[PDB]
């Protein structure tokens, strides 16, 4: 529920830094 | 999905790199 | 340019909020 | 792309929605 | 109260819009 | 409760995007 | 423009911590 | 407004507290 | 370890904001 | 540690200032 | 100093994610 | 400092890990 949504917000931020020029998938 | 993999337990930086383009 | 890098960091946050369960595919291109 | 369009001028939520999957 | 409604369950954009000006 | 405190932090970020120039009043 | 949209995003986050229980009202105007 | 006063120059925490409700 | 990671991310932002120029050191257990 | 003190209960700005440099 | 402050906020988040359990020093000036 | 090095030019993650304790 709420906890998963909050964790997902930090996931995309982590993906943005790690992936860089390659981009990332979020599904 | 990434949510079920990385929001129930902490994923490393290398594991996150699996989802890059 | 750092400002472009920082701007993209806010874009993915907005994309996560807007798309939600449908997801998205981010590319700096 | 998304960066060249939404980092020189602000983008509304409806404009950002077109980039969803 | 926005905390009681949206921190116990996920709030969509329309429900979030109701807290604007 | 910290988890409620952290949820409030994300709520105002979401309020900022959705409301835009109309603004908002985070009461809690 | 974009610079001030990004700055305002950090502004409301700063207000959330500083104001706490008192709350705050945000207006870009 | 707070944008014209704190995005053109740095605002302290004391100055931000002026906008609390 | 998910909750502590999420809390730590918000702690460092708060430490950056409230401390400003003195700086801070962050370390887990 | 700051984790054991502020991640199960809410710390104010004044508690967090103790971990400054 | 607005750009420096905004930049520093993201660096702190980046340092937290990269250093992890090692920790990091932060000193603006 | 890290601010001088990474706030006008993009620093990679492996560049940033040099500032870890
Ligand atoms: Ca963040
Ligand atoms: Ca954020
Ligand atoms: Ca933040
Ligand atoms: Cl969180
Ligand atoms: Cl920014
Ligand atoms: Zn969070
Ligand atoms: Zn930013």
UniProtKB/Swiss-Prot annotation, chain A:
Report the domain of life of the source organism.
Answer: Eukaryota
Q: What is this protein called?
A: Insulin B chain
Instruction: List the source organism.
Output: Homo sapiens (Human)
From Swiss-Prot, chains C, G, I, K:
- UniProt superkingdom: Eukaryota
Q: Changing residue 10 to D does what? A: In HPRI; Providence
Question: Result of mutating residue 24 to S?
Answer: In HPRI; Los-Angeles
According to UniProt, the name of this protein is Insulin B chain
Provide the species name. Answer: Homo sapiens
Swiss-Prot record, chain F:
Mutating residue 22 to Q: what's the consequence?
A: In MODY10; reduces binding affinity to INSR; reduces biological activity; reduces folding properties
What protein name applies here? Answer: Insulin B chain
To which species is this protein native?
A: Homo sapiens
Give the gene symbol.
INS
Q: Which residues of the full protein are shown?
A: 25 to 52 of 110
